[model samples]
Target: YSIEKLKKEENSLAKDYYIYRLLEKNKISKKDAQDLNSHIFRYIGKIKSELEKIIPLKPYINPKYAKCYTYTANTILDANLTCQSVRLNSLVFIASLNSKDRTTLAQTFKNQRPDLTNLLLAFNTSDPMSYIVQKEDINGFFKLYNYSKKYDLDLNTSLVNKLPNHIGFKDFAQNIIIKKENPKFRHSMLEINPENVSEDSAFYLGVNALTYDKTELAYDFFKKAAQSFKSQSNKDNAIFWMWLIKNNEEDLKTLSQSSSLNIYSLYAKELTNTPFPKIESLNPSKKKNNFNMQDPFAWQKINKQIRDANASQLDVLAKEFDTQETLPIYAYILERKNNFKKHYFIMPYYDNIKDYNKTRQALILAIARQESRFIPTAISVSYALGMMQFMPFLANHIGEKELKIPNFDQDFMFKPEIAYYFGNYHLNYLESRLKSPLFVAYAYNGGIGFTNRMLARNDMFKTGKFEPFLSMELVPYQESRIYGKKVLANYIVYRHLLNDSIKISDIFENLI
Candidate 1:
């Protein structure tokens, strides 16, 4: 993937790199980019374009191999981390690649020499691997565990221990014992302890535990596992083990540092009086924000214009609720829920049966006050629509299988019911996926996939001291990068108005 290697090949490689850069700014006219890309640039152009932004080189990491470098760069941006880090990481990534067909090369590296086709499919990130690594992907975990052991693939030990404990299997060796009465299989569950496990062992055990629940022995094994933590790996295992013992702030902070722990940290912080660290410095590389381009007051002007045009639309929904007897449902929901206050309010006619229903009502009025000032049919050029102004695709993904209405188009995103259903489902889904409702709110705004992958790659399983979310340097996406701070700030304000009895300053205190 290096230009130096291709210097002798008619300089074709260098040409490819040039076009690759141009194509990366996909904002350009595609007709010109595509034509140049298909001919002179060819496949190299494709790879180069995707990888142009990434440092090092992730050769053949994607279909175009090096092309995935660009994807990695984009992912870094989404995470709000330095593109430079991604570029640098690509150096390590490129080393993981070779000129030989990646599958064939990987097999040769492992001494498995299996059918190249099978290896290729297995190595594909989107195929079985993506499905397996996804949270709660039990079956996929087992398949990967078995495959790695069968080939004796070397995996990160610390990562293995971090896998969910509910799955079955033992150490990597015993997990692959699909056959009966295998004397070589280890009977002691402690052998598969997260502190010592590898990807192979974790996957195998995770699937088994998920299937059997192995509650008593697993708990004891995990307790023993916790006791065994003398090294960094052991500490990680201990953190997860502690969660099973109790869902509290200290455990959550530990889990957040592990990258494996997901959004549990946010909820934990909300429960405790955490302090936010002072912003000592801005990212040195970040471009100066154009005051005219990104003025925060622009929304105020827009809000005034909308109100002048339609005065009644914003208050119509609130009129149905009781003013004397009870607070709005939005207020109630916001009081109880740590996240999704804005989303909860945006959805029309949202049910408010829970105890904090008035909070949910207040939240709805709050959202109406902020977003479009209650404009029901407002649209943003960013393609956001309806009360929530949800992007079409997000609306659809959130609405997956829940509405039971088949093939719902995203363009109809203006429909209140559609937005409501999708927004609610998305909020609920994120709330369930991560232990923290605050993280869920952030994920809702920043794309859950982006947040999950960002947390996974940087904060969850990273080596060295765990940094707070704001200080974590790997978040790359601009929108998502700032999302955590904004959402937390908004949550603090909502908490104050709702009489949650916690001051915003106190919330900031514990985070530090």
Candidate 2:
């Protein structure tokens, strides 16, 4: 389409204006500007033309077109058009081309975009073992594995020999793959010696071993590093792990009584059943309000400004209101104006928890707060979507089986109501299996399978007696461990906000 045609459509003027400004700044000739505009339009038209051809073509379409089709298809795909432009069916067709054509296209894409190449390869081969062996792209293999895991594509086996001998790769293979396959399989991949490696390296090796369930090896490494490491933090971590693995009450008590304000010390106090230390509440100086809260139009003006402002510009608008009361008001305005924050407005729908208890509501809100900060439109790096950051596979399962909602696609997750509904439903399902809210949080953040295995471990669970605090500390994934703690803290805060008289300690007591 011409610039005039583009300008007639909604939200299309911005694209034209950006190109026009670029030409103005570069001071290019009219002929050059026309050439540049024509080049981009031609690129768009080419992609559209290829997508139309590829979409309608059958698996065994005329072989005469295969070579030319693959070449043109690769060029279009290489443009990296918007998701709206390159449909999934089109991608399937492109990948289902002749094997040689697929390989050539994938290799071409691999040089510039290994992520796309791996995706193409995943669609091409059910067994990626031979392809991985032949391609020998370390990063490409990782991308393929990641894509497979994310999409639940059973494309390959755990080719341990194909993996690089790096500590990170070993850790991933051992913990995520090998250990799952054979729990007793000893990971002799790395010969980490405290004398040969730096204190940091030794510490990481210990962590890697701990991650893969090599407890004894982890303890030994930590013990050696504890004495050798000069940093107080390293020493403290080592000591904490030793106490954690040994499960010595006296050692825990002694660590609890230590004067250090380290996180390890706090954890020790929890293990020893020491009461949490109280901190004095902050008392901020009161500031006079410029806008009246009684005035409903005040918020309307603020919302309009926030809506107009981009992220960086929003930062400037935020500085206009600094009062404690006004800060929350701005936060509420942001919640209403921001694409991510709009999920908060849908909190009233969560109140329809019907037969479920209020704690359930609190837990759902707590998880959502931590997961996406109420951003229904948010998507994680791993493609976890919506307000609750549900992975596509998880979302699909919950939609199909749990809620019985039909036609569940990833895009449906961006709707606030749908996200909160599935989010709460997932939590309820987890709660039914694992009774404790704390355990539910753990299972919610980390997979239920991993949580069950953790609970079964004698050292951590101790004859099926669950300790919430210790479980939090011993959680395998650092991200999930921290996530559980934050969710718990959020739960407590949300409970207090919902009912002023509710004591935080009471909620903690009930959780245990």
Candidate 3:
């Protein structure tokens, strides 16, 4: 009855969940729910049923749920590539399809997009290297080559060389450096004239050389990459390493004040003892927007309003969020204007957390700041929820184990106090083994298993000029790699507010 009252596709995961609740309750038929399930992020949402009933019959062409069907099928072999149900991103799962299927997929890519389809064919038999296109991804292969490491196959320089410079590069690069080199490294991008390779490939290949004793080759690649790369994040990444390789003081100074506020910028700040930009707290305005900031559904309405809102609408809404309780909205609005440098650091929920020690309080504030920017109702694309953004699995674990709240509603995360309670309780387990806030943040952002692997590495966090920063940058997963940096920055700022200053170097020196 209530399903008709909610907006469709507004908060997609939530909408999917509501549909799923009915399916599990036997209130809806699989065929009826098939179209509804298309918008859901998961194809695997089940109600303890058998085969075809387990995977509903949705049209392959639906944009939102095409991947849902893909997940259910698990292989594109024998599936028609021409179907509208096949989105480019979902095509990454094409690995399991055979060589015959591989040719069909790769050739289809060459036909649809550009001729840079060889990388798509590479993992299947690895001769896709012969069809390799030349090095100009000015449009970027990140969209196409995003799945290079998914194959778990052995690498040659040609295979590794074709990987995008984005987040996916590290997985292939890790195998080459730690697992021992194939003589194929001779043909790798290391030997390619620095000018010939794509800027994105140059950066990826440059990072591998930085680790593998090819400093001059690595330096040439990065210098060329920094000039040609389009994205500021990639350019900054290349620039940071260029400075590290050259020990150039001029580069260091520029990075300290750079706009990205990325790990490089923060590292420069630490090197120079320059302070991170301070946050601004606002006095309450005369009026309030009066929207319920704690309601997840209300957040969807507010999100749309903020996005579609013009200047006057924003101005009116800004005033509507003047109270301390509504500071996140106010901060979000102001930050959207300047992209959040000043307002990003605003610490809310201080009163509720006041009883915790300053150290624990600082950690909580730091995690929440990065997790949801302290928004109790925030949900990730993958559905990590609330201020702390706990995944349902972990949230369920903590709920049942400690809180005595078994199988809690997703709405339970929207409660600020309970979210805080769960987050703080979860931290006790993390803080016991991981001492560095950055490592702890990594574990918080990724998982304890990922952090454990970092700890297992012999060269990481040890003595060398690049000791920590090298490992820090190369820390496998992109989200967690960058997240640990932000969380560490947030942790230090909160620590300074709470007690004494702690240098990032101080934390690094003690990290193990």
Candidate 4:
């Protein structure tokens, strides 16, 4: 491409590629190259790190990415950048620093209390409550409370009950109410009308109210929450909670027509006669398709290019792959166009798992559809490989011990057939422990041990006002929570397609 064309290029992988080509030919201006350097900082993990070395990254360091520099923030921030946006990932550097610098930044950004608040939380986790009580640090307490949401811990709510209400206290009270189902705690939440706080907070209030058997209040909270939520999935989910509160048919009809194919919509469809919308299929391109499927860099570059491709360009690009080898590439093109209806649910490697029983086949398809969309050479951000999205350790275990493949190479996971073989064997082990497809999906995304830990909790998947449904949403691991929901939804589709339909709620009957 010409220098002008390269100058216009700036979309993560493609942008990096364009900049590299310019730099290689010595065509880039010094000022423009440095300007582009800062733009790529947000993509430190995904984009090429080599660009950082050449471009001299410190000049581009924002406090938000200060920790991303791997503790070079001490040097980078000596010039006094804002530390308000520092994340948990930067805890290493923060701990090594003296409080003088953090205190100074907090003083400078006094309005943004998170700067000092996060520092307090990081430094005081060993014995936080005493320090919190002594200092009356409500923000610090709330931040810690929010972090603790990742586990089912027995918190000292008695101590929290005494902490003088201040900034961030309302949120903390809302969270604490979820933990200790004290009906009197509702008084602390009386002033917090649903319209003022976040939609998520309102939803939690709704969950808390429902938990305490405050059905009418829960309905009102969920209604306000659903009205304010911006995301289609979030709104639909909030609406689902509302439907549960009253068993309102109007809400059920609204969910049945939801554009986002979420668990709520699936549940509504199961209850009513409204059939789930049909997924459209796309025939593969007849063009000569040949490339290394295992090369994530190559896959990323192609995907980046397609993101900016026009409808006509998509038509041409779709033909760049063979029908048999890269069905995912075809599906990806359609997806980039925001064409949600054409998900590639049909198994690209149909003959590989043909011998499996109907339910097992559906399970495999459901997992693959969510994992890679039948993308044989797919690689995740965590380095999970291929169609099954197996991590290296699990892949090696299945590859060497389970399948007994000689001279095991991790690269073999990128192949569809090998991935399916490995996936099949792993499923065998996961199924032995977890009977439900939803549990298996959780185990698939989050490891079996994590699922075990979850199942061990008395509050989760137990007989209650909400039982499994509420427990499903509040799951500690965000990845597994969302992953399980998506995979279960996909399972329903595949199960129906395979001529063995099952209800979402029926699967919950036997769940422990």
Give a tens-digit lDDT track for model 3, residues 434-470. 8777888999989988888878877777677666767
Expressed as tens digits, the lDDT of each residue in 1-512 for candidate 4 is 55455545444443454445466556666555665655441355423454544565555667666554553545534443443344323444545556666555545555656546555444635554445544645555555445544322333444344333445654554555644543444444543455555476677777776666777877888898889888878899899988987998999999988887778888887789888667766666563367666565568677767877877888877667536566678777767665564445666777888888878888888999899887776666555778898877788877778777899877688888888877888888899888898999999988998889888987788887776788886666767888998898888888877788888778767664
Q: Clash pairs of candidate 2? A: none
Backbone N/Cα/C clashes per model: 70, 0, 3, 0
lDDT of every model, 2 decimals = 0.40, 0.54, 0.66, 0.68
The prediction achieving the highest lDDT against the true structure is 4
How do the predictions measure up, each by TM-score?
Answer: 0.30, 0.42, 0.74, 0.69
True-vs-predicted CA distance for residue 389, candidate 3, Å:
0.7
Residue 451's C-alpha lDDT in candidate 4?
89
Ranking by lDDT: 4, 3, 2, 1
Better candidate by TM-score, 1 or 4: 4
Per-residue lDDT, model 2, residue 351, is 43
Residue 56: error of model 4 in Å? Answer: 16
Best by TM-score: 3
lDDT for model 2, please.
Answer: 0.54
Candidate 4 or 2, higher lDDT: 4
Please state the error at residue 24 of candidate 3 in Å. 5.5
Candidate 1, residues 231-288, lDDT tens digits: the string is 4434444444445444445665664444221123333434454432121111123233
Listed per candidate, the RMSD to the true structure in angstroms reads 19.1, 13.9, 7.2, 9.0
